[PDB]
Design a protein around this ligand. Sequence first.
Ligand SMILES: *[C@@H]1O[C@H](CO[C@@H]2O[C@@H](C)[C@@H](O)[C@@H](O)[C@@H]2O)[C@@H](O[C@@H]2O[C@H](CO)[C@@H](O)[C@H](O)[C@H]2NC(C)=O)[C@H](O)[C@H]1NC(C)=O
Ligand SMILES: *[C@@H]1O[C@H](CO[C@@H]2O[C@@H](C)[C@@H](O)[C@@H](O)[C@@H]2O)[C@@H](O[C@@H]2O[C@H](CO)[C@@H](O)[C@H](O)[C@H]2NC(C)=O)[C@H](O)[C@H]1NC(C)=O
Ligand SMILES: *[C@@H]1O[C@H](CO)[C@@H](O)[C@H](O)[C@H]1NC(C)=O
Ligand SMILES: *[C@@H]1O[C@H](CO)[C@@H](O)[C@H](O)[C@H]1NC(C)=O
Ligand SMILES: *[C@@H]1O[C@H](CO)[C@@H](O)[C@H](O)[C@H]1NC(C)=O
Ligand SMILES: [Cl-]
Ligand SMILES: [Cl-]
Length: 523
Amino acid sequence: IIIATKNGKVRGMQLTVFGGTVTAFLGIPYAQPPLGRLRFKKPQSLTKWSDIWNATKYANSCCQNIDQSFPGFHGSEMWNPNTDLSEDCLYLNVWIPAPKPKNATVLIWIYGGGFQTGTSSLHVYDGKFLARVERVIVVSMNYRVGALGFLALPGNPEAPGNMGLFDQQLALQWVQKNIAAFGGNPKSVTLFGESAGAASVSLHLLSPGSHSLFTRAILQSGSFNAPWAVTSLYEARNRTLNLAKLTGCSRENETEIIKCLRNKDPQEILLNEAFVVPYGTPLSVNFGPTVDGDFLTDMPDILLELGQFKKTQILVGVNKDEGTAFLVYGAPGFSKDNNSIITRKEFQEGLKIFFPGVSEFGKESILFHYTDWVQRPENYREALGDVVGDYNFICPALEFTKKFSEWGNNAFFYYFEHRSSKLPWPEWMGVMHGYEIEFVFGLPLERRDYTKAEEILSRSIVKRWANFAKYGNPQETQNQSTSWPVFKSTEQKYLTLNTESTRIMTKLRAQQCRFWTSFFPKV
Ligand SMILES: *[C@@H]1O[C@H](CO[C@@H]2O[C@@H](C)[C@@H](O)[C@@H](O)[C@@H]2O)[C@@H](O[C@@H]2O[C@H](CO)[C@@H](O)[C@H](O)[C@H]2NC(C)=O)[C@H](O)[C@H]1NC(C)=O
Ligand SMILES: *[C@@H]1O[C@H](CO[C@@H]2O[C@@H](C)[C@@H](O)[C@@H](O)[C@@H]2O)[C@@H](O[C@@H]2O[C@H](CO)[C@@H](O)[C@H](O)[C@H]2NC(C)=O)[C@H](O)[C@H]1NC(C)=O
Ligand SMILES: *[C@@H]1O[C@H](CO)[C@@H](O)[C@H](O)[C@H]1NC(C)=O
Ligand SMILES: *[C@@H]1O[C@H](CO)[C@@H](O)[C@H](O)[C@H]1NC(C)=O
Ligand SMILES: *[C@@H]1O[C@H](CO)[C@@H](O)[C@H](O)[C@H]1NC(C)=O
Ligand SMILES: [Cl-]
Ligand SMILES: [Cl-]
């Protein structure tokens, strides 16, 4: 199975899936390897080749630090790279239904990982179930992360910032220019991603250069207005400079700083990324998106508020316990191996861990808002998790959706509350950040693994996501399902996703978000 693309021929492989077949092209290059003088620069166009490029295995993952907090534990290791790390990592994957489709809608996945980690080859991102079951084409790309992907010297093409976002953009262009040859419709492309991947999707909604590269968008647990999503020009300068010093690259000429950094080995750069910030948190994004004046022309909050974004439909959602996952990466008294009952003192120490540069008054205000107990030994444990989840994910996703829908477009919001029967993390962590992904990709449809109720749930989510991509409406129209209403600034209706009963509810976390969205930004 050979497909002719603009830059050359590529050969795929046949996969058997649910008594059917899917053709996969894993590892197609979409840009010039960003090595040597190209390190830290925007991705460059790829020169044609002849011969047949074999896209039969996942390519290298981009350089990045790995989570070594729990060696041998599947809960954490399932997110680590499963392919060799390398600066030569600008590749993408394509899964297409078989027989070849005639004008299939295209879903483009952008992985998360705090803009410091991640890769498109993870098992939970395998696009073969969606291609098989919904007959859509699935594309996913690797983009640069960490300093190699986001180091910034605003204005300087040697390291302008947002390089990883331009990698994503160049892959979207590849789809525009080449997907028809695979039987895809470039006029029906939906971006979807989770966490930093969702934040990325939201930035493409803001970037004029990405406007014509896609049709609709799905944001799972993330948006650019989240507090960890955009690095300020101030922080970025201090960070690029701290990295320079830590690697012996400080120099009067900034362009000389970059030349020096280009001689360091990826490992010396990775090793020092951690220390570029005086005091970080388990949610630190040392090197992330910045207002570079190219991909992003102004502070995103201003663009959102003033309606400067691509006008189209959006599907946005969050999980019930977004914050718990981070508590075991630094909050005192927490452990994935016991019930983590903490005390008021520990809760207070926890706030210090998650809100390092916050005034004492700021922290007390968080404590006052979350400790008006409705006794229960797990009050403080549960409160710190909600504090972290509301501030970092839920409230920002809700504000993004409200502000976006005020300009006229249909928006749909979900609250995912099902805890995987297979979750390796303890029960107290609940419906964790990242654990809706396997349902969206259809892993529970594979019986060889999950309960019957999960197969059904995953089946409905898959259908709703596909209907959103193809038709701009996330409904499951055949099995007497709850209709998903549009989210409007007034009523604020949202759909809950679970195995029990799906319900229409209103004003998710109203009281908590008024605190984070209106008040807290002032302290
Ligand atoms: C901007 O960076 C300075 C410098 O950071 C230090 O040096 C870097 C190379 C790196 O190794 C960091 O870990 C160091 O902290 C920050 O200033 C530091 O502030 C802390 C406060 O706790 C102090 O203990 C250090 O001595 C200071 N570093 C020095 C030697 O001046 C500064 O905090 C950063 N600016 C911001 C955003 O606050
Ligand atoms: C839950 O465990 C934490 C973490 O302790 C580590 O992991 C445990 C499972 C066990 O193997 C310990 O020996 C490990 O050190 C406990 O938190 C520690 O508590 C002690 C005393 O309160 C304190 O001195 C340490 O600083 C704490 N460590 C951390 C990371 O906070 C916690 O007490 C346990 N809670 C329970 C059993 O409910
Ligand atoms: C690509 O795959 C074909 C068929 O498997 C093989 O003949 C060819 O040598 C491969 N090209 C390489 C390894 O460069
Ligand atoms: C695919 O459908 C689009 C409309 O969405 C149409 O413009 C295009 O011509 C179709 N592509 C094919 C099958 O040629
Ligand atoms: C609808 O119901 C049928 C049979 O009752 C079931 O097999 C199928 O998975 C359901 N389809 C969706 C999209 O949930
Ligand atoms: Cl490992
Ligand atoms: Cl239902």
